Amino acid sequence: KAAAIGIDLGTTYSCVGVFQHGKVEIIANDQGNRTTPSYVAFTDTERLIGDAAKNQVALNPQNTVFDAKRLIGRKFGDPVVQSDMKHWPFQVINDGDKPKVQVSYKGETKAFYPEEISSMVLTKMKEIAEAYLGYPVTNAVITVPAYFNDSQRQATKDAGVIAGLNVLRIINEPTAAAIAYGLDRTGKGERNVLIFDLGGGTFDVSILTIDDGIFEVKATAGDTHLGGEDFDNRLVNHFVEEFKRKHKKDISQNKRAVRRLRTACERAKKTLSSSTQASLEIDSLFEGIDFYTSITRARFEELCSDLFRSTLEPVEKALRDAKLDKAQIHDLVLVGGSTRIPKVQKLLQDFFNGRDLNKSINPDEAVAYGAAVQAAILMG
């Protein structure tokens, strides 16, 4: 009788849905947010997950973990791990050629596997669903990137099992997004679907063939270090210059200020997807100096124009790989929070010569939406 849930375990944000009453419900967390930061923080006295964790990241950069998805299922000597390490404020150590995140927790040094950190996020998403349903959840579908290997999929599933979940299936994020739009219901005859996924940290282009409910991955492309956080950064640097000009002070080395600016920037950015201007007002940003100011959509676009534009060549590459022309793509699907940006939608639509974009499902929710559907199918 109990519904199974669908979980998007995201690099920067996660999302949970449940199919019931003949429809998918994306479930808001305790703060009312329909997605949750994939953050876990450790303090002298408690463990925080999601919104609570990200909310104190500037205060505790050392023991606030994020990006665990970049580690999960990898060996410590993997060049991706070695490269990514150099830019996290938290320490990563080697335990038998397995990466562990090392932190201080209740005064003692503790280390955690990536799948342990991710299980804490999965636990939160599970608790979010249970608060809405009013009963314990034990079955779930969890998603992963198409490019995940066996080791990565295994560790993701272990994360689920650790969270107390029977993992009915692990499915690809682009397939979940396609399922959400009901594209799996097609009969015999190949349809070509392109998934354009620009999230918080990663950019993924997938071309799938669907034939009588059977998915095949024809081509993948993108950039694992291109995302919304890079748009936040462009804004950070802009406002650091503007604060320097006005107050004649350089805040760029105060890690707490820069982090707090960064957060205000992400909020303003989101607002610029619905508004042509946004107000940025930080109390005591630096040395008790407040920062009240504004930014326009057009200025935001200018600051990011090259990054926005860079998203189209991986589409070209993926089409070439799949041996398809633009015109042979039957459906275009927007995934990831960053595809809410009007300029981004314009770029892709212009690239496809005016074709419709499938964007009626919040793109940062499309993966979980699909997972919830598949979970229900697997339950009966």
Catalytic site positions: 8, 69, 173, 197
Closer CB to Cl ion, 204 or 229, in the complex:
204
Q: Is 269 in the site for ligand ADP (CB under 6 A)?
A: yes
8 Å CB contact between 128 and 27: yes
Question: How open is the CA angle 152-156-160, to the nearest 5 degrees?
Answer: 165
Give dist(CA 320, CA 219) in Å, integer. Answer: 9
Q: Which residues contact 55 (CB under 8 A, 6 or more apart)?
A: none
Q: Which residues contact 181 (CB under 8 A, 6 or more apart)?
A: 331, 333, 358, 361, 366
Closer CB to Mg ion, 297 or 314, in the complex:
314
Using CB under 6 A as the binding rule, the residues of this chain from 4 to 33 that contact ligand ADP are 10-13
CA distances from residue 271 to 196, 240, 294, 300, 305 in whole angstroms, order as listed: 22, 20, 11, 11, 18
CB of 7 vs Mg ion, minimal distance in Å = 12
CB of 203 vs Cl ion, minimal distance in Å = 6
Closer CB to ligand ADP, 116 or 266, in the complex:
266
Give dist(CA 367, CA 16) in Å, integer. Answer: 9
Measured from the Cβ of residue 260, the count of other Cβ atoms closer than 10 Å reads 21
222 binds, among Na ion, Cl ion, Mg ion, none (CB under 5 to 8 A by kind): none
Q: Helix H segments across 134-227? A: 150-162, 173-180
Which residues are 214's β-sheet partners? Answer: 211
Give dist(CA 257, CA 48) in Å, integer. Answer: 22
Q: Is 340 in the site for ligand ADP (CB under 6 A)?
A: yes
If DSSP codes are grouped into helix, strand and coil, which group holds residue 197?
strand
Q: Enumerate binding residues for Cl ion (CB under 5 A).
A: 197, 199, 202, 204, 336
Rg (CA), the chain: 21
Terminal Cα distance for the chain, rounded: 10
CA distances from residue 174 to 45, 259, 369 in whole angstroms, order as listed: 40, 32, 12
- Matching residue, tokens 């429809």: 23
List 315, 341, 348, 373, residue binding ligand ADP (CB under 6 A)? 341
List 148, 336, 369, 370, residue binding ligand ADP (CB under 6 A)? 336
Closest-approach residue to Mg ion (CB) = 199
Closer CB to Na ion, 25 or 242, in the complex:
25
CB of 211 vs ligand ADP, minimal distance in Å = 27
204 binds, among Cl ion, Mg ion, ligand ADP, none (CB under 5 to 8 A by kind): Cl ion
CB of 13 vs ligand ADP, minimal distance in Å = 3
Closer CB to ligand ADP, 34 or 191, in the complex:
34
CB of 178 vs Na ion, minimal distance in Å = 16
8 Å CB contact between 291 and 281: yes
Q: Helix H segments across 212-272? A: 228-247, 255-271
270 binds, among Na ion, Cl ion, ligand ADP, none (CB under 5 to 8 A by kind): ligand ADP
Q: Enumerate binding residues for Na ion (CB under 5 A).
A: 8, 10-11, 13, 199-202, 227
Closest-approach residue to Cl ion (CB) = 199
Using CB under 6 A as the binding rule, the residues of this chain from 222 to 261 that contact ligand ADP are 227-229
Closer CB to ligand ADP, 70 or 340, in the complex:
340
Angle between helices 228-247 and 297-309 (to 10 degrees): 130
List 6, 222, 314, 337, residue binding ligand ADP (CB under 6 A)? 337
For 138, half-sphere exposure in the C-beta direction (CA atoms, 13 angstrom radius) is 4
CB of 238 vs ligand ADP, minimal distance in Å = 16
Closer CB to ligand ADP, 50 or 227, in the complex:
227
CB of 198 vs Cl ion, minimal distance in Å = 7
List 273, 311, 358, 374, residue binding ligand ADP (CB under 6 A)? 273
Q: Provide the binding-site residues for ligand ADP, judged by CB under 6 A.
A: 10-13, 35, 199-201, 227-229, 266, 269-270, 273, 336-338, 340-341, 364
